Amino acid sequence: LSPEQLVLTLLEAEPPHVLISRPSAPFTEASMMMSLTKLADKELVHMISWAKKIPGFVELSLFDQVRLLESCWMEVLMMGLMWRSIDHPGKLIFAPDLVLDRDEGKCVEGILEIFDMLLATTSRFRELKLQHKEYLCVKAMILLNSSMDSSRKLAHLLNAVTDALVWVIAKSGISSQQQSMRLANLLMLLSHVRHASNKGMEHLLNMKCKNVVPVYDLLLEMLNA
Amino acid sequence: LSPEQLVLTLLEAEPPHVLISRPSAPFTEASMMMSLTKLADKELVHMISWAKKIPGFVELSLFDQVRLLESCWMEVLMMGLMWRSIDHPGKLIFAPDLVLDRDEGKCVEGILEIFDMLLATTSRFRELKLQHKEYLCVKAMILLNSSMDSSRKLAHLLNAVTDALVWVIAKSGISSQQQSMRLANLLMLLSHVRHASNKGMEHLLNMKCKNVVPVYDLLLEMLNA
Amino acid sequence: HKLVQLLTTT
Amino acid sequence: HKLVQLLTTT
Numbered sequence: 001l002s003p004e005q006l007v008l009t010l011l012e013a014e015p016p017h018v019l020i021s022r023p024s025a026p027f028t029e030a031s032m033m034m035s036l037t038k039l040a041d042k043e044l045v046h047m048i049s050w051a052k053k054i055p056g057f058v059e060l061s062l063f064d065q066v067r068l069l070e071s072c073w074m075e076v077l078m079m080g081l082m083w084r085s086i087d088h089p090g091k092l093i094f095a096p097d098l099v100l101d102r103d104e105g106k107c108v109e110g111i112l113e114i115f116d117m118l119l120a121t122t123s124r125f126r127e128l129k130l131q132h133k134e135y136l137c138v139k140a141m142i143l144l145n146s147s148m149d150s151s152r153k154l155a156h157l158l159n160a161v162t163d164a165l166v167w168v169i170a171k172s173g174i175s176s177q178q179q180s181m182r183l184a185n186l187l188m189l190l191s192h193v194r195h196a197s198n199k200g201m202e203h204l205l206n207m208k209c210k211n212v213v214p215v216y217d218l219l220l221e222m223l224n225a
Numbered sequence: 226l227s228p229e230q231l232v233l234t235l236l237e238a239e240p241p242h243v244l245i246s247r248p249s250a251p252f253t254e255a256s257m258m259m260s261l262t263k264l265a266d267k268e269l270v271h272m273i274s275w276a277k278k279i280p281g282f283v284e285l286s287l288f289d290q291v292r293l294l295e296s297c298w299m300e301v302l303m304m305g306l307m308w309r310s311i312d313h314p315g316k317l318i319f320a321p322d323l324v325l326d327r328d329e330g331k332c333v334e335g336i337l338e339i340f341d342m343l344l345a346t347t348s349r350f351r352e353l354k355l356q357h358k359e360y361l362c363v364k365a366m367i368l369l370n371s372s373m374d375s376s377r378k379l380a381h382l383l384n385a386v387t388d389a390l391v392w393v394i395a396k397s398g399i400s401s402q403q404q405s406m407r408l409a410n411l412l413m414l415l416s417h418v419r420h421a422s423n424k425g426m427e428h429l430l431n432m433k434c435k436n437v438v439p440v441y442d443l444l445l446e447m448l449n450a
Numbered sequence: 451h452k453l454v455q456l457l458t459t460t
Numbered sequence: 461h462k463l464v465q466l467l468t469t470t
């Protein structure tokens with residue numbers, strides 16, 4: 001499978017656009033948090049289907065598939081959040097009916113910290129002009145590189161995706177020196193997605209322990225795990 | 226400042242190995258935490274000197290310097306640890322006379338997990354056969370990329386080191402494709418190092434609150450920071 | 451076990 | 461404080 005066609009399958013594995021079915025209106029602490037949690041739960045369902053459409057993913061032992069998703073789910077959600085917000089500077093497009101601002105994240109203690117992180121990283125990807133195909137590979141890599149017979153299968157898959165990202169960059173038509181610099185800069189931004197991730201989950205866990213948000217079944221499980 | 230000059234500059238800047246003496250009697254939860262904390266404290270001092278040598282670092286605003294160091298100190302320490310243990314599978318070389326076997330981590334409640342991932346990542350680097358010059362650049366990138374027009378100057382300093390890493394890898398003589406492939410493989414490991422960093426600090430804050438061992442001065446400041 | 455049932459069904 | 465002094469005083 002050539003890099004170009006692997007990237008295609010990733011385009012086909014893309015989950016559908018999700019909405020929380022919420023009528024426009026100001027956000028209170030309760031509505032915002034229940035909205036973010038409800039949205040995450042819906043997306044998690046689509047994330048599982050997405051992963052399975054990644055060539056070779058279902059070939060991995062059930063134990064690996066589970067460990068990979070249980071560890072990277074939040075990062076993948078936020079990577080999707082950042083690609084959706086790329087064209088809307090100063091805003092976080094969690095969903096069509098869930099667009100938030102930095103100041104609106106002030107009604108919830110500790111979340112403003114995170115909105116700022118999500119906005120800075122998003123702003124960074126914006127400057128670099130992240131391309132759709134680059135986004136596809138990066139998100140795939142986030143899932144396949146979260147490993148903290150099946151093992152060889154993983155490395156081979158991660159390698160294929162890495163090989164696909166290098167290809168995408170190569171098509172851009174820029175200098176070789178600039179291809180390496182772009183590859184390094186895109187990959188380094190991952191650490192930033194991962195950090196906003198750990199903070200986002202630490203915050204959610206706290207919210208759960210306080211039964212302040214309805215932690216739906218799939219979301220709770222992923223959280224506890 | 227060419228890539229080679231930046232590399233040689235980082236080489237000269239390498240901190241000298243801190244010598245910590247191994248406790249006389251077999252490790253206990255307390256003596257081990259004491260040894261690891263004392264060592265960290267001493268290395269943190271050298272790390273500060275090392276940082277001031279990274280070209281352009283002292284040009285950043287004092288606050289950027291502080292934020293960068295506070296945000297990545299443990300990751301830098303562990304990157305060093307792994308490198309020192311590169312040629313000793315199943316062994317963690319914290320210091321010349323402090324060679325901790327993976328098993329000895331059983332005396333500390335919940336530290337074995339960290340020892341495992343530290344060893345795993347170390348093996349990954351061993352597998353990739355990480356070179357000294359690559360190592361130098363990567364460790365500096367960890368510091369400059371922890372941004373978790375001085376902000377504009379930070380980006381520039383990060384590209385210079387990245388630029389030096391690309392130069393090092395190119396001198397290996399492998400094909401252009403493989404150069405890109407090796408660059409990606411090296412950077413994709415920063416996530417794993419970071420993970421161990423988070424679990425390391427979370428485990429230290431925990432041990433402090435349990436009064437397992439004292440944590441003050443430099444170490445404490447860096448912990449809360 | 452929500453994750454596993456979705457991993458084994460379509 | 462201690463971090464600041466090592467950075468500016470040392």
Ligand SMILES: O=c1c(-c2ccc(O)cc2)coc2cc(O)cc(O)c12
Binds near residue numbers: 040078114
């Ligand atoms: O960012 C999120 C998300 C979230 C939702 C949809 C996405 O696409 C990405 C993140 C969900 O729950 C939270 C719950 C929190 O307590 C804090 C957060 O930052 C979040």
Ligand SMILES: O=c1c(-c2ccc(O)cc2)coc2cc(O)cc(O)c12
Binds near residue numbers: 339426
């Ligand atoms: O790994 C470390 C280190 C450490 C010490 C020297 C190094 O070069 C690298 C890491 C220090 O304190 C800890 C404290 C902990 O509670 C758990 C850990 O894993 C560590």
